[PDB]
Point group: C3
Chain length 428, copies 3
Amino acid sequence: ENLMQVYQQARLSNPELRKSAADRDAAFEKINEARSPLLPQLGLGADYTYSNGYRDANGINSNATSASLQLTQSIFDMSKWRALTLQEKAAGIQDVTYQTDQQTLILNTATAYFNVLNAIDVLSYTQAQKEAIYRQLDQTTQRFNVGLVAITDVQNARAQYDTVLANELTARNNLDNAVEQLRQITGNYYPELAALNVENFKTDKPQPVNALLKEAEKRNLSLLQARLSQDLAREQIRQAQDGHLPTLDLTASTGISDTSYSGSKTRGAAGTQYDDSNMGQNKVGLSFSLPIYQGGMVNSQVKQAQYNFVGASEQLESAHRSVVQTVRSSFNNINASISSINAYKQAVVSAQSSLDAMEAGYSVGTRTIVDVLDATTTLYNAKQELANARYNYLINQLNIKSALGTLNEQDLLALNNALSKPVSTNPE
Amino acid sequence: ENLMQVYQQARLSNPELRKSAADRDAAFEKINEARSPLLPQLGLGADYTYSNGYRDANGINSNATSASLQLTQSIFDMSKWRALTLQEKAAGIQDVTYQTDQQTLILNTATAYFNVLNAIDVLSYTQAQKEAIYRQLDQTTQRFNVGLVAITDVQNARAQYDTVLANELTARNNLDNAVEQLRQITGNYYPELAALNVENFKTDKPQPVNALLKEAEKRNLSLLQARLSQDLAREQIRQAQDGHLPTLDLTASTGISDTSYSGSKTRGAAGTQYDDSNMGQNKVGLSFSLPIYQGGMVNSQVKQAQYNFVGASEQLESAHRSVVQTVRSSFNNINASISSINAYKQAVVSAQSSLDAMEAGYSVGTRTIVDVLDATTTLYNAKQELANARYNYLINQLNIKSALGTLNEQDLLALNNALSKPVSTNPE
Amino acid sequence: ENLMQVYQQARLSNPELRKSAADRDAAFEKINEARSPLLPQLGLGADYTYSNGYRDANGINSNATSASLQLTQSIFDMSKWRALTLQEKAAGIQDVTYQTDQQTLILNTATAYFNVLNAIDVLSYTQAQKEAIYRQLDQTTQRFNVGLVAITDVQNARAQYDTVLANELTARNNLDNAVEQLRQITGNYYPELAALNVENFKTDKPQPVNALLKEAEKRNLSLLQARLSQDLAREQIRQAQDGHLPTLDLTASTGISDTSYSGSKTRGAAGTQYDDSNMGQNKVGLSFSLPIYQGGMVNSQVKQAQYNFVGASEQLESAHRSVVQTVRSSFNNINASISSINAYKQAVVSAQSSLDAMEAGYSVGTRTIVDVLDATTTLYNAKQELANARYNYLINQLNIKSALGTLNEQDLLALNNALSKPVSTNPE
């Protein structure tokens, strides 16, 4: 029901978040799959061959049976150590994108929570407008019946009451759809939420724009990732450079091997060479490989990886500009929101005083019913505007913390302290 | 020209649908390329080697000539059978993707078709509004000349007639551009379409929301795909688990091989071993391989696939939530659309009668030309809003069938039975 | 400060463009790595093996050491020449996507530049509007005090001024944020730009739409790329057809190998074959390989690439339709913008004359202060719409050149010649 409670329910069950957690876990586990080629490799081979000679070897025939435990082990292969740090850096990237999504859920939940409250205020003021204009229509009907105003006053009022009835269908649909927006992010249907406390409402100026810019160069999660993704591209130059290096491996086996010969040219003038061997071997070998020249394959692989590096350096300058914009435009939006709140507060007062003036003039002949119903509209538009600005103010508080990198449950606790009484998401 | 006609022409030539069909066809044929490793492999090798011994083998030299038909055949290899089932499941996913896109074309054509109709109505009404305001301007001009109204009445009318001539440029532009939207989907330019029959227009309450939900958990194609994609991730656990199993292959060959020796140390104290061999061989072997230990490569490959399965299970909770949204918010939009249709019908009535009331009042001095022109605007604004609600109603029937999974040509035939007389997409 | 100068500073330092340049450079360099396997391969192998015989060869034991220069050399391998042409065409594709991005930077820079200008006009008109209505409120408050006009006039004026105060906050925020849009594309904050010259403003009819469609079928960058991507898919059929072809390689080596035997069954009944070999080898060989049958692997690989060809043939029909839309709707938007410019010109005139008429009416009792205020609003709304259409006009000049393929720095020079005096992006 309150926002703390809505986010708690959302944190346990959200599929976009829990998917992200799965991607992070896979990437961390894959760390092990990248260590594995640096550890003992141990397979058992085991065949059976039947040969049958012909043409100048006709009459000599075998069948062999082999079986062996084989063992490989890297001693020096830098490309195998690279695949390991490259997959540890990849898991570091995924861990930051997880932190980004954890933050997205906070933002999107608060945003959707406030949208529903906004939609409750739009409909509640559209209903207050409906009722005020109906009051006019009813009292004009009374006044017409007794001879005091003309039929025109009634007809004008009705037309304008009909407009408001149709605006209420829109108002109500927007509310049902915002409630469904919420259910998508949350899993639950909420019959009521905790409304923003309007008698306790104050705003505070933001921190100066450079203080916020400094904090974001330090802590923004999108540009931690961009930086990590630049590390990754540099270590990818190093992996390319490794194709030049020599490799030093180790083999080990323990294999048996039968072999029985038979047929016509197997004895007489052979001499021991086609008997029965029943061999047996234990090996330990060291392999050594030095590339020298593969067509310029390495080199071009290195130059590719160098360009990829400037590429990732540009994506870092892209992510910086992107955060410059989010923070500076958030700063501006907050300021503007404060400015709007004050502007629309003033507006409501003037609008009501205008409405009171219309009604006065109506009764002495210097304004019409049309003027009165217009001033009723102005009033309720101003009110709606006011409520809309307060929600914009708070959403922009959240967008700023988001752009900082620091948006968490403490920030949501603060917002929850500005809420109070229950309000229904499905009234009449 | 009618909607059935417009979709018929669009089904045969639409590029986004015909590419999807090519994606489906490629994934189905790739079933063959996944079977191929479980079938006979048959290559012909054939070399010519020239050796030249030195240092403690100086003076012994050969030239060898070989040639062989080789044959491989899988007897037991579980990972080869998986690759086949995994590409069968992939073509099953791609066939749903295709059914999804076959649906998008229906939805997208019907939507674009009604958008054109919508824009014809907006411009039609703007023109009706232009002509009504003109009539006012004309008759005010006449009355001014003859001494019955002030010049202020003419000036006021001309200002408001100018505003509407500018609105006409934008309504005409929107029409041109939605005609272009439709040519993109359709291939053709249409000089006329079948307009919505508004004489025969009735709306119907939708089925209750739970019945629609039930129907969509059964038949929605986005979530058939998410389910098949969860099956795929489970079979991917199995493919990883296969790295543990032993493999049993089969070899077969028939190979010739010459070899003539030559030079200094090839006779005297050799004894038969450096003569002319003219070998000949027929083989049939069975290989056997059991892994035992590869560094924990398998296992971590299995744990990766286990997490990627929780991931696909979250994407299945994601696509459920998103179809619960699409149906709930379509059922809301449809009810609201009917409500709006009723509200604006009643509005057009009161608007007309409030316009007659202004005209009455203008002639006895209790309203101005300004109120008359305003009431003319209110009137046309409501008619536009009513036409727009009818389109909104039908578009939402379409979106709900789409979220159901069952949007087809019979649905499009129903909508086409609600059309009638031809209306131009480029009038004046 | 001017548009030429803003784009110059943008062209040097834009991250999106410079990254695209890095992708192009990597694709062109990778041409080298695709030639590499058609060129001499040359590695140095060198082991040390220690054997230990048992069961029916117990007592016979070796240690061998080898070392060799190995050389590979392609003589006939069609699929190796394919990977070369296929990476050449990929670089051709990437070079066109670079040309496309070079174009996007011009378009996005001119768009963002005029967006700032437009937001400067909105704010400056909203300010003009504020002042006009303030003059009204002041002059009514004056009249109120000396008994000429009632209280009601003051109250209506105030309410309406409040509304315009509020509009100012948002008009100023839109400008700050369009300034921010420009810093993202640009790197720089600009305290002033060169304003559109409105004294010298003329529009020109565009070229006929078929003429512009013809020029775009020839030169559009998105559909050169779709065409190149069709070529690439055809060459991809050819690469699969290569799996059928025979391969002709060449080997060469120069290898030493020691081997010292030892232990008990080493002498007596051996006879020469367990002494000390110190071998030496020079080879030059020719390998030959012909597929015949791999399970229908090739064939299905060819069928897959045939379907992938019709796919890219459909993406070509898609990109054609998409530029038929961008040119035709740009032609339509240009004409309509011209039409708008004309209609709002005339609207300002009539609106000012209507305002003059409301004033005159107010002083003789046939209109109220509410009419005068309303007519002030109408006037400023028309002026805003006129400014807006001029920017619209020029942006669509830009969008059409981009749809043609020919958008360059000459086009940006022409637009810069339609600019003049400095105007501030942060006034008061």
